[PDB]
Design a protein around this nucleic acid. Structure first.
Ligand SMILES: NC[C@@H]1O[C@H](O[C@H]2[C@@H](O)[C@H](O[C@@H]3[C@@H](O)[C@H](N)C[C@H](N)[C@H]3O[C@H]3O[C@H](CO)[C@@H](O)[C@H](O)[C@H]3N)O[C@@H]2CO)[C@H](N)[C@@H](O)[C@@H]1O
Ligand SMILES: [Mg+2]
Ligand SMILES: [Mg+2]
Ligand SMILES: [Mg+2]
Ligand SMILES: [Mg+2]
Ligand SMILES: [Mg+2]
Ligand SMILES: [Mg+2]
Ligand SMILES: [Mg+2]
Ligand SMILES: [Mg+2]
Ligand SMILES: [Mg+2]
Ligand SMILES: [Mg+2]
Ligand SMILES: [Mg+2]
Ligand SMILES: [Mg+2]
Ligand SMILES: [Mg+2]
Ligand SMILES: [Mg+2]
Ligand SMILES: [Mg+2]
Ligand SMILES: [Mg+2]
Ligand SMILES: [Mg+2]
Ligand SMILES: [Mg+2]
Ligand SMILES: [Mg+2]
Ligand SMILES: [Mg+2]
Ligand SMILES: [Mg+2]
Ligand SMILES: [Mg+2]
Ligand SMILES: [Mg+2]
Ligand SMILES: [Mg+2]
Ligand SMILES: [Mg+2]
Ligand SMILES: [Mg+2]
Ligand SMILES: [Mg+2]
Ligand SMILES: [Mg+2]
Ligand SMILES: [Mg+2]
Ligand SMILES: [Mg+2]
Ligand SMILES: [Mg+2]
Ligand SMILES: [Mg+2]
Ligand SMILES: [Mg+2]
Ligand SMILES: [Mg+2]
Ligand SMILES: [Mg+2]
Ligand SMILES: [Mg+2]
Ligand SMILES: [Mg+2]
Ligand SMILES: [Mg+2]
Ligand SMILES: [Mg+2]
Ligand SMILES: [Mg+2]
Ligand SMILES: [Mg+2]
Ligand SMILES: [Mg+2]
Ligand SMILES: [Mg+2]
Ligand SMILES: [Mg+2]
Ligand SMILES: [Mg+2]
Ligand SMILES: [Mg+2]
Ligand SMILES: [Mg+2]
Ligand SMILES: [Mg+2]
Ligand SMILES: [Mg+2]
Ligand SMILES: [Mg+2]
Ligand SMILES: [Mg+2]
Ligand SMILES: [Mg+2]
Ligand SMILES: [Mg+2]
Ligand SMILES: [Mg+2]
Lengths: 148, 185, 157, 234, 51
RNA sequence: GCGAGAGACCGAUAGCGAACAAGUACAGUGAUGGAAAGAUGAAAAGAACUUUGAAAAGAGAGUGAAAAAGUACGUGAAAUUGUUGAAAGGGAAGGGCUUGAGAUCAGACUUGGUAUUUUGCAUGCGGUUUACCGGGCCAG
RNA sequence: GCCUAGACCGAGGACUGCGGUUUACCUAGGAUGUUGGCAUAAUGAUCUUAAGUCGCCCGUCUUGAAACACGGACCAAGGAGUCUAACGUCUAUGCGAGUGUUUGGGUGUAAAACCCGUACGCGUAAUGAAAGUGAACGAAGGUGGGGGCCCAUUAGGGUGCA
RNA sequence: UUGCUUAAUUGAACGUGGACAAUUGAAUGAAGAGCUUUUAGUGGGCCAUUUUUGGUAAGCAGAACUGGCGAUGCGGGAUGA
RNA sequence: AGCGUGCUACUUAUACUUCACCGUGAUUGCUUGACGCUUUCACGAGUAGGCAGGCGUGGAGGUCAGUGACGAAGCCUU
């Protein structure tokens, strides 16, 4: 709303809050990112270091679909188990019958190993796993089955 | 005339009321305005002050933090007070039976507290079973995990997060972050 | 003025006054005011008249007589602050002024018969004592005025 | 019928209040006897000390000696200069003496630290050695206490007791005694006292204030003529 | 509500200092001193007069 | 372009340049440039007649709810101007504060109570004036 | 200790307190008593004017303006920090490890309201130029503080979120 | 306690346990202390005392500390930042 | 009624003292208005500039079953 702005309160005061000496001018200092190496160097060096220059190698025609590999951690892995059947599984899982968690079908590429698992065997199907994620799954008596 | 040793006509700098116009939040302060005014219990003066705080000053409290707070020695039946929303944590393997008093509960949090034999009550229900806050334990959420704080106090050799819209090798990584490209700060 | 209605909590009851501790204590007249002293009236109809002081009434006023025969100023009250008390004195030990009080001068053209009779009876004794001092009648029958070069801060009365 | 209900309640509570005031007044009588005895003891020791010093002076005169008086331990400092154009160090010193307005007065116990403080404020203050009666007149007419950061008149000994009873001050005369003969708790008693706000002198200052009292001005140490000045200003 | 000067209001003076009553009763303000009529400066203190 | 329905838009210096005989009048050799300008009244009932005047017109009269609506047309502000009235004014005027003087305005005899003399109305209601109780304000 | 002249003021509004004189009274937590006059008015306000005193033309840039610095003869109407795309802080709100119905589909009393979901965006993982790798020694750590809560009994101890 | 140090059982740092209780170790003051985010205007200055440089000097030019004017009316200096 | 110097009294700033009222900050208490009532103290200069609380205008949703041709709006006026 225009009625709540300070433009309405500056009516009657000569300079409208812009100053009598400094005044409001068109573009003192330049337009946009002008002067980044000369008189706005003090700003870019302090608040945006690394702005100028090239680092690393280019990639012509980069398709981000090649690099799609969403992560799921171990502490969030049991949320892919059916919610209505999670509690019985946490009890009745064994080497003879452990739940299969198809992580690729839930939209994940790599299983990572942050957090702690239930001391319960599980069969985890993943495209990729980390060394510790698979060590923690095997320690609770589970296994990782590679898919594609 | 006076030689002022301090600034004159200075507001206290603390909220004396909620900024919110929620009529039900002001009814709770009306209860705790009365309690802070009349019980001499330090618990009630803290709650009245905490009801004024803003949203960023009332971070969500996960039900896992309450689980860790209930795991203190001699704290299994203390009553947890959260002036704000209590959220769920799907990373828990288990939750105890507990009484938790909060402004709000999420669906996962309320289901999990009651599923494990606990209670999810409001702060007015607390004021009747504990008008002096006896045997309570106030839980506050993490204030510094917010994203805006990542960029607070940014500067050379300060180790904070730049305020930037895109992330990658072409975005503020060359000169001033690397000795091969001049200097590093 | 505006359309702001009065509210229900705007009461109309008038509080009682607090209990006041201004207990009055009696007036102290000037040392020059002793009954029988001749006074000069400064204000009112009889301003400038020299009159005889008789009694201190309980209303803080002074009972005064001309005498009426000498002056034409009757028995009446004056305020002590509108009188200059001279040093001339008349022996009023022989004048009975007991029946005179505030209710005597109560507000009710013509003049009551009681009051005229009392005027004559008081004026008889005042006159009997006034004749003794020569020129006291002449002085009382004469009006007071400030002549040119009269300084009341330097004059003795 | 609310008339008789409310009348009965005030008269019942009035009788209860009357009984409570009886017990309170009976209890308060002993405390007032205590403070009466204290004031009498203070007066006796004042007179005896005065006569003792006088006798010692006469004896030293008789015995071909010179009795040198004990140096004054207390001073009353009045800021007689406005608040404009004050250098930073004396401005800070005057603020630390609680002299933040013109015609503000404060009590100072003479040590070395406080003496060098007053030396810094010397071009802006008139100070001196106050008599007992000057102290009493100041505390009685313009004596105020700082209670929860408020300037409250010392109109009843209960205010003084409630704020300085942990320092054995139960009366206005205990406070005056503690100030005059600088007592073990002079600091607390003088800081509890709000700075005295005096008027201008009846009779004026000298022709030009802001020069030392020795050179015909008003600033600096005037020692016993501060009593005449306080009489002018209080 | 109104500060009253104990140096003008006698009731306030007695409220603050009960010993003022005894001061008034004993005429402590005009108390005589009992002493002998002596003059101890007859000797060497006349060094003030001349030297 | 054609045909429709709409709008927290603008309301005749606005909204398209144009609400009107507006891309008009007019300017420029020319390309081009380009306005101003809406409102009597429900209805002309747009004032017959008489009179003065060379005439425009004016005065009577007439129409109209209104002519304080007469095509100079609803309302008709200010600048500016005439007349009347009031006032001031020795090389400006104008202003603040204070009081005087003149003009204007305001307010408690209250929604005053008790009766009462005494009267207009529907035993009772409104007025009125004399008494007493009491009240308002300014003062000693 | 005592007597005495004048000025200004009278905030408050049942009682409650501290004292003084003796379950009473007072000068002691803020003015009452009494009398006169006025209500066609004493009283108060405004306007105009006279008198006394003070008062330079505003706005502007400027260290500095009444300036011999600039605009302004006068009046009316108009007249200048907006909207949008993308963002920072703070705040309110809904839901919350998720969140966002409105691209679209359904529906409709039809640009409204009501309803729907796959995807997608942001978030839930970082780091390295990249190939790549990828977050619990421990009750998700220890120490010194730390509000609140618990046991105590000045003190002291326990538990200690942010 | 240690992977550092000493010829060492010597030391270094950080510790467990014990002793020293409100005069817990000068004065004065403290409308309390600590902490965070965000943003305006500004980035021509000038003056007075004192120290002071260039200059014959200047109502000149340049520094040091403070206080002022600017940004501030009021009483005084007739008038005057 | 000049110069140096001493003395007594007197004159008056928006400064100081006591009081009233306004606002701001704090502060005491308060179980059909607590976004309210109440006790108390201190403080009040301000360009550029920040913030707060308000006054006014065109139009919009709701309401006052609001005003109005028995006179709305506009306009002039001690
Ligand atoms: N998906 C990228 C863009 O996101 C935009 O929307 C972004 C903004 O509307 C919104 O901005 C939030 C801000 O509100 C909030 N208070 C803080 C938060 N950091 C901001 O998010 C920001 O950071 C994220 C990365 O973390 C960026 O992807 C985003 O563009 C940027 N605005 O968060 C959204 C996250 O993307 C637009 N939908 C569009 O330009 C585009 O889709
Ligand atoms: Mg403004
Ligand atoms: Mg301004
Ligand atoms: Mg202007
Ligand atoms: Mg601005
Ligand atoms: Mg400008
Ligand atoms: Mg600028
Ligand atoms: Mg990556
Ligand atoms: Mg002030
Ligand atoms: Mg974290
Ligand atoms: Mg580092
Ligand atoms: Mg780029
Ligand atoms: Mg190098
Ligand atoms: Mg290179
Ligand atoms: Mg005098
Ligand atoms: Mg047009
Ligand atoms: Mg046009
Ligand atoms: Mg028209
Ligand atoms: Mg003809
Ligand atoms: Mg008409
Ligand atoms: Mg008309
Ligand atoms: Mg017209
Ligand atoms: Mg005109
Ligand atoms: Mg001429
Ligand atoms: Mg007049
Ligand atoms: Mg009153
Ligand atoms: Mg006048
Ligand atoms: Mg002038
Ligand atoms: Mg200019
Ligand atoms: Mg210039
Ligand atoms: Mg100017
Ligand atoms: Mg000039
Ligand atoms: Mg210029
Ligand atoms: Mg120019
Ligand atoms: Mg011009
Ligand atoms: Mg012009
Ligand atoms: Mg999603
Ligand atoms: Mg994260
Ligand atoms: Mg290791
Ligand atoms: Mg800037
Ligand atoms: Mg800048
Ligand atoms: Mg310059
Ligand atoms: Mg500049
Ligand atoms: Mg400037
Ligand atoms: Mg100044
Ligand atoms: Mg002047
Ligand atoms: Mg001069
Ligand atoms: Mg002269
Ligand atoms: Mg001389
Ligand atoms: Mg004043
Ligand atoms: Mg101000
Ligand atoms: Mg509009
Ligand atoms: Mg509307
Ligand atoms: Mg109607
Ligand atoms: Mg009208």
């Amino acid at each position: 709303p225009t009625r709540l702005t300070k433009t309405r309160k500056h009516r009657g005061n000569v300079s409208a809050g812009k100053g009598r000496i400094g005044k409001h001018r068109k573009h003192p200092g330049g337009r946009g990112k002008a002067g980044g190496q000369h008189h706005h160097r003090t700003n870019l060096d302090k608040y945006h270091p690394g702005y100028f220059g090239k680092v690393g190698m280019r990639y012509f025609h980069k398709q981000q679909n090649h690099f799609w590999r969403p992560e799921i951690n171990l502490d969030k892995l049991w949320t892919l188990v059916d919610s209505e059947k999670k509690d019985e599984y946490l009890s009745k899982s064994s080497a003879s019958a452990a739940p299969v968690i198809d992580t690729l079908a839930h939209g994940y590429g790599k299983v990572l190993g942050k957090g702690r698992l239930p001391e319960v065997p599980v069969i985890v199907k993943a495209r990729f796993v980390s060394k510790l994620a698979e060590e923690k799954i095997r320690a609770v008596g589970g296994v990782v089955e590679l898919v594609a | 005339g006076r030689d002022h040793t301090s600034k004159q006509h200075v507001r206290s700098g603390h909220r004396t009321a909620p900024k919110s116009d929620n009529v039900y939040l002001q009814l709770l302060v009306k209860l705790y305005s009365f309690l802070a005014r009349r019980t001499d219990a330090p618990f009630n003066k803290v709650i009245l002050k905490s009801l004024f705080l803003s949203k960023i000053n009332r971070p969500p409290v996960s039900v896992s933090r309450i689980s860790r707070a209930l795991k203190q020695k001699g704290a299994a039946e203390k009553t947890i007070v959260v002036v704000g929303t209590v959220t769920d944590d799907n990373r828990l393997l288990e939750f105890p039976k507990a009484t938790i008093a909060a402004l709000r509960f999420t669906a996962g949090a309320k289901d999990r507290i009651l599923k494990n034999g606990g209670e999810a009550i409001t702060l007015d229900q607390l004021a009747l079973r504990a008008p002096k806050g006896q045997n309570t334990l106030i839980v506050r959420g993490p204030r510094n995990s917010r994203e805006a704080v990542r960029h607070f106090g940014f500067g050379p050799h300060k180790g904070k997060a730049p305020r930037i819209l895109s992330k990658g090798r072409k975005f503020e990584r060359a000169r001033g972050r690397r000795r091969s490209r001049g200097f590093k700060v | 003025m505006s359309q702001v209605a009065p509210k229900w909590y705007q009461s109309e009851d008038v509080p009682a006054p607090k209990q006041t501790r201004k207990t009055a204590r009696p007036q102290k007249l000037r040392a020059s005011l002793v009954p029988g002293t001749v006074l000069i009236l400064l204000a009112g109809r009889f301003r400038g008249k020299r009159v005889v002081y008789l009694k201190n009434l309980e209303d803080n006023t002074l009972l005064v007589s001309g005498p009426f025969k000498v002056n034409g100023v009757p028995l009446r009250r004056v305020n002590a602050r509108y009188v200059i008390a001279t040093s001339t004195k008349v022996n009023v030990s022989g004048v009975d002024v007991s029946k005179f009080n505030v209710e005597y001068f109560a507000r009710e053209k013509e003049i009551k018969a009681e009051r005229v009779a009392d005027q004559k009876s008081v004026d008889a004794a005042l006159l009997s004592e006034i004749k003794k001092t020569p020129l006291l009648k002449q002085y009382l029958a004469a009006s007071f005025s400030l002549k040119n070069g009269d300084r009341p801060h330097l004059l003795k009365f | 019928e609310t008339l008789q209900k409310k009348e009965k309640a005030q008269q019942k509570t009035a009788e209860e209040r009357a009984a409570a005031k009886k017990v309170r007044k009976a209890a308060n009588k002993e405390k007032r006897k205590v403070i009466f005895d204290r004031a009498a003891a203070y007066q006796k020791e004042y007179t005896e000390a005065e006569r003792s010093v006088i006798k010692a002076k006469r004896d030293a005169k008789a015995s071909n000696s010179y009795y040198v008086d004990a140096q004054p331990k207390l001073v009353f400092v009045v800021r007689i200069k406005g608040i404009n154009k004050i250098p930073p160090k004396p401005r800070k010193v005057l603020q630390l003496l609680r002299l933040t307005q013109i015609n503000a007065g404060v009590f100072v116990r003479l040590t070395k630290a406080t003496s060098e403080l007053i030396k810094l404020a010397e071009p802006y203050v008139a100070y001196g050695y106050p008599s007992l009666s000057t102290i009493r007149q100041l505390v009685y007419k313009r004596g105020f206490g700082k209670v929860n950061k408020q300037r409250i008149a010392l109109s009843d000994n209960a205010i003084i007791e409630a704020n300085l009873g942990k320092f054995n001050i139960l009366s206005i005369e205990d406070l005056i005694h503690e100030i005059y003969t600088v007592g073990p708790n002079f600091k607390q008693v003088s800081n509890f006292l709000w700075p005295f706000k005096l008027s201008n002198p009846n009779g004026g200052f000298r022709a030009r204030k802001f020069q030392h009292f020795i050179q015909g001005g008003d600033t600096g140490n005037r020692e016993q003529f501060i009593n005449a000045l306080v009489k002018q200003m209080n | 509500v109104l500060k009253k000067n104990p140096l003008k209001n006698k009731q306030v003076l007695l409220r603050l200092n009960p010993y003022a009553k005894a001061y008034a009763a004993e005429k402590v303000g005009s108390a005589k001193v009992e002493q002998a009529k002596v003059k101890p400066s007859k000797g060497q203190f006349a060094e003030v007069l001349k030297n």
